[PDB]
Write a protein that binds this ligand. Structure first.
Ligand SMILES: [Cl-]
Ligand SMILES: [Cl-]
Ligand SMILES: [Cl-]
Ligand SMILES: [Cl-]
Ligand SMILES: [Cl-]
Ligand SMILES: [Cl-]
Lengths: 978, 984
């Protein structure tokens, strides 16, 4: 009787209906916008010929003049606005073209003025300038990510502060782990990361509110946000002629500082001919220490704390701290302080509120009723809401500066901890920043540290958006992910530990740290990860202060050999192999890095193998949503069963019918090759020979049992005596959920068969054909083809296009691009190479953040930060902002530029775009420098198949391995393809 | 170097500083208010002579005129406003008394106008009338609780809908368990139970916003909320002369209805001389099915759903449902519909929005930029925000009615479930409510069901606030807690299962249900609880669809005998004992109720006992924050160890389970009572052998307690057996050596006293002694606290620290539930003890404690005491006197029992044992009492002073026959019986 129509099942869209109605009467262009005028969807109001997709109608319908005019026609008639000439006209299905009245025309003209830049634009330095009134392409588009700096201090990974900042400065701020300084919000909308008050302030004049930092009213004439590397600057101009600048950054750690401090500087310039007496109220919400109790017992979170006030030596109020009763929430101590700088004079706040209800009173957060006159009452309960007040006079043409310091001290950086330690550290912070210029100097330390950091690799091309995008923005993101893994962002808000696997981030950032003198830090990290390997060779799946989930996932330890291979090959520092690092098993057991690397290979090569001598899948490997195994087991559980098996009968096979992971075999084969080269370089001929032979034995196992006519299988299945299911991931697996596709195909089977150097040239060609047929979509390379794994009872969680139901997972797509690039350099068939390169560049174009500003309202994403996946139904780039995408994009762009590090130096083999005639970049090495220049005619060119000349400091060279020089001089490398 | 000053400090308060400065210069009256004018606390601005405590200064400082005036004096100098005549003056420390300017005087006069009623007031019917501008005494004060009605349908406990509504209609709404219909919010503030948009709407005129249901602006002239039993009515009058009425209630279940529906009716009357063309936009946020993912993965919650639109037979849009991909979130289906009634004609909404960002756009939720012209775009993603729009014209003097229906259908009430079932059920709902008067009729069904429900017991005294407070409000709360246990309220928002123990609620509500013909329902509940007892006699600690945590807590099964004793004694229905109910062990095993009650007693009396033959404490008993035991065990774990012990011993089932585990004295009292109960039941069932057996076992247990648990001062709480040392022997009396207060020898638990008397173990000499101890150490100016300070770290495995500041919860609060159990004991003793002076004193303490718990009294001094004037709260902070939530606790249940006990009603085998204990100042008490097959009118008169039947001269008559013993039979002649008691 009643009918249901879903958003996806709805037939025509508004724009398609507009075309059906007006397509043969006016030129609609190729972009238009429209909305249905009624709940039944029979008519549309639209606007024609836009320069790109944009929600123009929704911005128009905010205008009162325009909605009144349309009301004469809508909802009972369809309509389209057209600028046919330079006046606007309204057009009806009945042919009429009516000139709209002058005020409607003024408003339409103004609305459609700057549509090309509604999502903002990028400066030449890669910074995102955003208008605060314009709509958002999506919830991650207008977001920036900040990070502190604890390099050279205790426990860098675990103690580096981090925050998220949107275009109005909203969001939140953390110290160690998921410790909240400013309150995170866990609610319905992705846009709401923080409690709304966080970082916001009000200005008053004569008892009247005239400004709120997060409300654009008629008093605001200009309002812009600029997101840069590790700071955000938000600028306003009011009609009363004030110029307000908010600058937000995290303080780099110094001796004696709190573990975490966020600095917001507020500059207020009076651009008028008269002095003005104003007051500022600065607001925010401290995070609770009892995060779980937010869901389970909110009253608890409130009663366990009370507000407290801070006073200096002269009895002057300076700030607020939330005081906790339970000892478990007393190991961190939060604070907020404000300094008002009026020329010479510095002063502190004169009033405060610590109760949200008294502050808002009868009004709202945008217009609080108790916001000017603060009651100075310390709240006996939480939550830790604060409001700090101060009056001040700004003389004509002059500026007053308000510096706020918000932060946390912690036992994690201090022995014998109490709140006394916070008080000392806060004093150190405030003394260090007594001078006004002290803040500008630190901001410039930050800017310069990051500019310096990126100089490991600089592109210098005819495209400043790409250059700045890689040279600054991507460099920063790969730094960020080295410290933060996947643990914090706009929509990453829950507690996450560091994934053993996510040592991948170090694959890219390594070279950056080494080249600004932090080689010991990279060493530190290798060792921290190495301490999470058990004697038997498996790894803790996660660790933070301490490791957990021992050998839960089969792949983890294998990643470590790539990290070490990368470090040792680059620095030649073999001494790392003799280091005695704790084993994850505990006691006080230590083991030489060398013997650990041998144990990891032995676990996957000899012990935890299946019927075909390939590594066991266990619960799962890299692919987390591939859960099959009938009664998988831990590494600890396996260890105990392994030793009983040995009694009932070290290094022999653990017997079982468990499935085998082909991906792991590829990781293993690569790991072994890596160890061989390492041994050779370490002058250990026996280990090098042993591993070299083991590499051949594993290659033959894969080639014989995993190549399935079409593709490398993903999983080998051994538990059906039946022979009913034998493998998954190639033709004849009998597991497809698409009738048009025989078999299931995983992108990583291809990617790792090439990255491990197992696939022959004929097999690569074959797999590339399959990929073009079935994994390549108009939005890139999807992870897997549709599968029916129920045959070995879980249903899907996602509509088509999202995540595991057919998305382009950009991290996996970049691992596949790495394989394509590697193959394009080596395969004999130049035509195959050309095509693999085309695919690589096609996929890179879909991932480069800056390109999200071409068609931002369809593609969304974030123009400075890589996002996780592309919805294959809409093309939208979907968060989170932290993923393996940035790491592998970085590696890939450097690979395309031709840089690969080997034992004898740099193997130089660039693959440029067909249309490029020139590529230039600079490269730092620890004890030298390089300038590279590559020229070629239009068309596909590579060293394996084109004529070329290579010069190093003007001397023609036949050897394409360029040595790592140590003379501290800049070396000119020139490559001319004929 | 830097100094820290917490909110808890010994510094002078603002009011005390005001007194120090102005006390000898102006009359400050009895009450004043003040605030510090600066962050250093050196000066105050205040106002003198208020009729009660109130945040008058804070309300004044909202006024722009007044804060400007004060700025001439503050912050550098102190000040006090004083009214002299009809003019206001400002007074300085330097004596000057300055007349304030006329606009400041206008504003001060208006502010201080109605200060006595700033927290609202109660109608004679016990309804709370609240002004929407005035401040809140606390986060639970302005809150109402609503409930559906699934009586006579499947699984009543688990399927009854419930919602919470504050004075602006904010909050949320649930179906089964913690299934959200409208979205709950889990954030920093206790005031924020729901997503802000829930239940709110906007009115437009000529494309201009003129009204928002949750914003009081200059256009609003009056704005009032009325909270009644199971509905809330919110009224507004605008300056443009509209009268808006919002009525909110939950729909009682009917055949074919959705499992949960909330109805909000919006009436808009044009009180002007011209027609007006308006439109309404009705908003809200559907709850997600993926609650955990709100913390763990918010993007997930968004992508797993999309919006969908609903259309009737004529292709007319009627509403929105959120459509889910994953099967796990497709077993419930939510909807929202709106009907606009303009006289005879009904119409449906003409537009919608399902995207919060498009709706708010450039503005805010209070003033949305996209709120008038809705884009009609179905959102491909969540969250399930909705906005429904409709234009309408209201003629002069006429009213239009907008009915909204929000709800959920579920597989939990339907086999072979799909969203098609929702569509059918929604159609049944909309057909049933086609006629305008259909809504008023259902509201009246609700009003009348509750008025009828309360007629089990009606007080008719010279105090309407007390009468309505007990007769309607408390009746309702005890109903609510029978269905909801402790699972939902303003600040109870997480998932909670039903505690075996919380069958206590049925102790009070039982009689109410029976007396409106729902005796089977009470029977159903007894049986549902009985199915969670295992063969061996222990119980699942929690159950919802299914039971869990088998014999985790030692007390649970013991409560069941009180429920049955209460049912059987009242109805005489012994047939319940032959009923075959499933055992919690599963298979298809059933057992007779009779043998289960025997198994419970055997478990605690014979099997799970310690060295002194008293029941084991195990992990814990009633007191959850009493965790000690070195390596406690489950009942299932115990069972398995018990059967191997019997093998390695040649034992007989029923022998003792051997261990050094501690014993619970509270459980011994529960046991002793349980056994007495079983004896009386057997006697009534004509089972003379069981009755004799239990009577003897009651004596044997009484001697064990009396010999091993009485410790010169008090009954111990716990007996400790694991120290060969003899280093610690007991906890809960003098010489236990476990006090954390140097001034107190020993630790004293309120429940040791309470249950020693409720079980009838304590002698008269022991009661006198314990009452002395209680007056010394447990009685505070804010009532009876649960326990005295203890140092349990000496005997626990842990090294636990406290979580609470002094006064809150386990650090010294008055837990009102425990205080009401102690008052029950005081009342029982006051009736029986030989010493009349002791009785008099116990009765004073009882009434003193009841006065601190009666909700209506929270409106005397509301801004210190807070609470809620219609609903009992959980505890009183012993530092401030504030009544703190949640709104659901054992307090209401035991308050109900206690007030009925004081009125003199106790049910026994021979009928009603009538022994009233009136207040000293009362000269008269009247009430009516329903019984299943008769009725009673009671009248009691006495002179001023303490009076009781054990020690005063009196006459007692029944219709006109003198009674000499206290017993009034339960008549069955369907007539009203007049009972008169005259104390001389
Ligand atoms: Cl994969
Ligand atoms: Cl994110
Ligand atoms: Cl990822
Ligand atoms: Cl207790
Ligand atoms: Cl509550
Ligand atoms: Cl309780």
């Amino acid at each position: 009787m009643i009918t249901k129509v879903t958003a996806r099942n709805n037939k025509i869209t508004p724009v398609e209906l507009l075309n059906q109605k007006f397509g043969n009467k006016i030129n609609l262009g190729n972009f238009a916008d429209a909305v249905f005028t009624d709940a039944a969807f029979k008519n549309v109001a639209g606007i024609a010929n836009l320069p790109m997709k944009a929600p123009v109608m929704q911005v128009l319908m905010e205008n009162c003049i325009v909605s009144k005019y349309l009301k004469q026609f809508v909802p009972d008639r369809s309509v389209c606005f057209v600028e046919e000439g330079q006046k606007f006209y309204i057009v009806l299905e009945d042919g009429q073209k009516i000139e709209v009245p002058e005020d409607v025309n003024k408003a339409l003209k103004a609305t459609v003025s700057d549509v090309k830049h509604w999502a903002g634009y990028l400066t030449e330095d890669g910074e995102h300038v955003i208008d605060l009134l314009k709509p958002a392409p999506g919830p991650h588009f207008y977001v920036n990510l900040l990070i502190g700096n604890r390099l050279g201090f205790k426990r860098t990974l675990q103690t580096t502060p981090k925050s998220v900042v949107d275009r109005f400065g909203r969001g939140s701020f953390r110290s160690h782990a998921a410790t909240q300084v400013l309150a995170t919000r866990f609610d319905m909308r992705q846009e709401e990361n923080g409690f709304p008050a966080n970082r916001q302030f009000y200005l008053y004049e004569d008892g009247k509110q005239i400004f709120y930092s997060a409300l654009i009213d008629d008093n605001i004439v200009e309002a812009t946000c600029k997101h840069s590397c590790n700071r955000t600057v938000i600028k306003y101009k009011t009609a009363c002629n004030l110029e307000i600048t908010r600058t937000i950054f995290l303080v780099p750690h110094k001796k004696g500082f709190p573990l975490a401090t966020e600095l917001q500087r507020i500059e207020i310039k009076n651009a008028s001919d008269k002095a003005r007496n104003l007051s500022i109220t600065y607001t925010g919400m401290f995070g609770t220490g009892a995060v779980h109790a937010i869901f389970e017992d909110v009253t608890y979170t409130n009663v366990i704390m009370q507000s407290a006030a801070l006073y200096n030596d002269k009895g002057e109020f300076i700030g607020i701290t939330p005081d906790y009763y339970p000892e478990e929430f007393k190991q961190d101590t939060r604070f907020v302080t404000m300094i008002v700088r009026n020329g010479d004079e510095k002063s502190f706040p004169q009033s405060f509120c610590t109760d949200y209800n008294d502050f808002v009173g009868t009004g709202t957060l945008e217009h609080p009723a108790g916001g000017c006159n603060l009651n100075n009452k310390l709240n006996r309960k939480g939550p830790g809401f604060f409001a700090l007040g101060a009056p001040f006079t700004v003389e004509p043409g002059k500026t007053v500066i308000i510096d706020t310091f918000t932060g946390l001290s912690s036992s994690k950086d201090n022995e014998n901890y109490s709140d006394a330690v916070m008080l000392r550290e806060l004093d150190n912070l405030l003394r260090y920043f007594e001078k006004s210029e002290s803040v500008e100097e630190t901001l410039n330390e930050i800017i310069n540290f990051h500019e310096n950091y990126g100089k490991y690799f600089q592109f210098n091309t005819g495209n400043k958006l790409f250059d700045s995008g890689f040279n600054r923005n991507l460099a920063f993101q790969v730094l960020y992910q080295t410290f933060m893994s996947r643990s914090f962002g706009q929509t990453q808000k829950g507690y996450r530990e560091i994934g053993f696997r996510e040592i991948q981030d170090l694959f890219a950032s390594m070279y950056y740290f080494i080249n600004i003198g932090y080689q010991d830090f990279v060493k530190e990290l290798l060792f921290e990860w190495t301490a999470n390997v058990y004697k038997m060779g498996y790894a803790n799946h996660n660790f933070y202060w301490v490791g957990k989930q021992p050998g839960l996932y089969s792949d983890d330890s294998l990643w470590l050999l790539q990290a070490y291979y990368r470090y040792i090959i680059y620095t030649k520092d073999t001494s790392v192999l003799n280091e005695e690092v704790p084993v994850a098993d505990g006691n006080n057991e230590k083991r030489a890095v060398r013997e650990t690397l041998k144990a990891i290979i032995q676990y996957s090569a000899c012990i935890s193998v299946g019927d075909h001598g390939l590594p066991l899948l266990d619960l799962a490997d890299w692919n987390d949503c591939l859960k099959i195994a009938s009664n998988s087991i831990d590494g600890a559980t396996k260890e105990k069963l392994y030793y009983e098996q040995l009694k009932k009968t070290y290094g022999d096979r653990f017997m079982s019918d468990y499935s085998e992971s082909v991906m792991n075999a590829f990781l293993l084969k690569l790991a072994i090759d890596h160890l061989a080269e390492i041994a050779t370089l370490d002058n250990d001929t026996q280990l090098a020979q042993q591993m070299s032979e083991l590499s051949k034995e594993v290659t033959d196992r894969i080639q014989k049992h995993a190549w399935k006519e079409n593709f490398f299988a993903r999983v080998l299945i051994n538990r059906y005596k039946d022979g009913s299911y034998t493998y998954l991931g190639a033709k004849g697996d009998k597991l497809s959920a698409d009738p048009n596709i025989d078999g299931v195909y995983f992108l990583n089977s291809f990617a790792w068969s090439v990255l491990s150097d197992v696939a022959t040239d004929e097999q690569i060609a074959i797999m590339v054909d399959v990929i073009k047929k079935h994994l390549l979509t108009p939005y890139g390379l999807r992870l897997v083809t549709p599968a029916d794994l129920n045959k070995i009872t879980a249903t899907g969680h996602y509509f088509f296009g999202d995540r595991e139901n057919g998305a382009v997972f950009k991290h996996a797509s970049m691992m596949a691009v790495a394989a394509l690039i590697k193959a394009a350099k080596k395969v004999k068939d130049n035509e195959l190479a050309k095509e693999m390169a085309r695919i690589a560049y096609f996929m890179i174009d879909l991932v480069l953040p800056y390109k999200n500003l071409e068609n931002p309202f369809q593609v969304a994403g974030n123009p400075r930060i890589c996002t996780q996946y592309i919805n294959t139904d809409t093309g939208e780039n979907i968060g989170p902002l932290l993923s393996g995408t940035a790491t592998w994009l970085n590696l890939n762009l450097i690979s395309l530029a031709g840089i690969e590090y080997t034992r004898d130096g740099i193997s130089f083999n660039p693959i440029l775009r067909e249309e490029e005639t020139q590529l230039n970049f600079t490269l730092k090495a620890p004890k030298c420098s390089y300038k590279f220049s590559i020229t070629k005619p239009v068309g596909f060119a590579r060293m394996e198949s084109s004529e070329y000349e290579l010069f190093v400091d003007g001397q023609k060279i036949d050897n394409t391995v360029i040595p790592m020089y140590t003379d501290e001089k800049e070396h000119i490398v020139t490559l001319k393809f004929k």
